[PDB]
Paper text:
The type II secretion system (T2SS) is a conserved transport pathway responsible for the secretion of a range of virulence factors by many pathogens, including [name]. In addition to cholera toxin, the T2SS in [name] is responsible for the secretion of biofilm matrix proteins, chitin-binding and -degrading proteins, lipases, hemagglutinin/protease (HAP), a collagenase, and the serine proteases VesA, VesB, and [name]. Although many bacteria use the T2SS to support secretion of proteases, [name] is one of three unique trypsin-like serine proteases found in [name], other Vibrio species, and related marine species, including Aeromonas hydrophila, and may have a nonspecific and perhaps toxic activity inside the cell compared to other T2SS-secreted proteases.
Well-defined electron density maps allowed the fitting of all three domains, the protease fold (35 to 272), the Ig-like fold (273 to 380), and the C-terminal domain (381 to 511), with the exception of the N-terminal residues (23–34), including the propeptide and C-terminal tail residues (512 to 522), due to their flexibility in the crystal structure. The structural comparison of the protease domain of [name] (VesCPD) with typical trypsins showed a high degree of structural similarity, with the best hit found in VesBPD. Consistent with the structures of VesBPD and other trypsinogens, VesCPD displays a similar positioning of its catalytic residues, and the three disordered loop regions (residues 164 to 172, 216 to 220, and 247 to 249) in the position of the active site are also observed in the crystal structure of VesCPD. In the crystal structure, the interface between VesCPD and VesCIg buries a 1,568-Å2 solvent-accessible surface, which is ∼28% larger than the interface between the homologous domains in VesB.
Residue numbers in the entry: 35 to 163, 173 to 215, 221 to 246, 250 to 511
The structure:
């Protein structure tokens, strides 16, 4: 019961696209001014200039009728880790003012409480994550305690059972990820949620609970403009500086108090400090300031330099900023030679490196509680094939494989077999992480990869 929508019914629909391209990757909504609301999982750590917005998206074969605007910055909730854990919310600051256009009204707690079991709600979208023309479909509200019991296998049941009140559920296509869900509150139409995760039976949609983010949402729209998340990718351990510019694109003063900067982790040798800060006090409409910091990365890990600046003007009390990094050393020549039959851009390793032993790449001797890491950075789409062999008396000594930061395989101690990973996607990263567990008592715990190949086709 998905009906095509009529132009004009939802002028605040937004579609997200790669810059100047006409292919929708996520949905969204217009909050007014220069701001669009979407899901964090749609945009987290992306370069904003890579993206466009189509306001009033309707027909994707006539995108002239929508207004294309470049994105200037992305703001993601400071608690967001993944869609299942919640806080799946983000705001995009557009480069310029849109043509006058109606904006969505955001739900507040009192509106949310009107919701009861089977209250109909409306979802709109093109069905991304399909339809060239916008559809709308009605769905029933499902209370969190019931939603939490959904699923028939570990993966879903675990995802559903871990839900919190930063999210809510409605009974199940049509919406895009990041897209809006509405309820007619008698106080009028309100956007209640954002499509976050989840024709399967008993698998309701999960949506970000916007009634619990009104303060964060208002803060983001005050107009402070800066690059909140920058991913540096792979970095060598060493000493660096970085500069961040803040601009007030709002109409009112924004007060900025004290400042913290630090590398996230437990290392005592990692460090960060302010080297220059012109943003203290009161930043004024149209004005800019800068924060420069030094940072020292010594532990090989995937972390981020965090900056926090307090603000009395902000209801949530502070401004967050991030510089993500994956600290690893370059694979030496022997290893690059070993992998030369792959079309890989770059190979990297941690401090307990995989190195060539005989016909195989093998984990370095590693202490309990540590891991041996190798990263294959920038492979084209296709399949990676390999043989693996793990040997440890400890059952929690295991090999974990990620493709583009998504977990894709686990391999158990004392087992050997051929495996294949599909790398969909234009540009791919494959990370091998052998974890010797905290309690592992086998000092010989190891893994070996051999027969490693790239196949550009996906069968046979």
């Amino acid at each position: 019961g998905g009906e095509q929508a009529t132009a004009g019914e939802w002028p605040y629909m937004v579609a997200l696209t790669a810059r100047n391209s006409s292919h929708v990757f996520c949905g969204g909504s217009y909050l007014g001014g220069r701001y669009v609301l979407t899901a964090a999982h749609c945009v987290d750590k992306e370069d904003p200039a890579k993206g466009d917005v189509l306001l009033g998206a309707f027909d994707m074969n006539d995108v002239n009728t929508a207004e294309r605007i470049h994105v200037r910055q992305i703001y993601v909730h400071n608690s967001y880790i993944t869609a299942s854990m919640g806080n799946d919310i983000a705001v995009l600051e557009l480069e310029r003012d849109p043509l006058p256009r109606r904006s969505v009204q955001i739900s507040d707690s009192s509106d949310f409480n009107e919701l009861t079991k089977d209250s109909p709600m409306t979802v709109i979208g093109f069905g991304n994550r399909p339809a060239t023309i916008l559809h709308q479909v009605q769905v029933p509200f499902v209370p969190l305690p019931e939603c939490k019991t959904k699923g028939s296998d570990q993966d879903a049941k675990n995802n559903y059972s871990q839900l919190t009140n930063n999210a809510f559920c409605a009974g199940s296509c049509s919406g895009d990820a990041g897209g809006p869900i509405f309820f007619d509150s008698n106080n009028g139409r309100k956007q209640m949620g954002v499509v976050s995760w989840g024709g399967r039976a008993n698998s309701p949609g999960v949506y970000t609970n916007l009634s619990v983010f009104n303060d964060w949402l208002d803060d983001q729209q005050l107009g402070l403009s800066y690059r909140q998340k920058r991913d540096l990718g792979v970095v060598r351990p060493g000493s660096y500086t970085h500069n961040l510019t803040f601009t007030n694109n709002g109409n009112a003063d924004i007060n900025l108090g004290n400042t913290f900067v630090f590398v996230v982790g437990i290392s005592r040798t990692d460090a960060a400090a302010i080297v220059n800060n012109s943003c203290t006090g009161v930043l004024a409409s149209g004005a800019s300031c800068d924060v420069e910091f030094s940072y020292n990365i010594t532990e090989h890990k995937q972390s981020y330099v965090k900056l926090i600046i307090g603000s009395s003007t902000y209801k949530t009390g502070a401004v967050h900023a991030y510089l993500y990094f994956d600290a690893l050393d370059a694979a030496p020549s022997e290893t690059v030679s070993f992998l030369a039959n792959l079309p890989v851009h770059n190979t990297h390793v941690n401090d307990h490196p995989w190195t060539v032993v005989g016909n195989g790449l093998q984990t370095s001797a590693l202490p309990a509680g540590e891991e041996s890491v190798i990263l294959l950075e920038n492979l084209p789409q296709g399949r990676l094939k390999f043989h693996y062999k793990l040997s440890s008396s400890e059952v929690l000594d295991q090999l974990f494989v990620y493709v583009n930061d998504k977990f894709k395989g686990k391999y158990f101690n004392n087992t050997e077999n051929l495996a294949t990973l599909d790398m969909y996607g234009t540009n791919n990263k494959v990370r091998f992480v052998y974890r010797r567990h905290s309690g592992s008592t086998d000092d010989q715990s190891r893994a070996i990869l051999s027969q490693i190949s790239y196949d550009p086709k996906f069968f046979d």
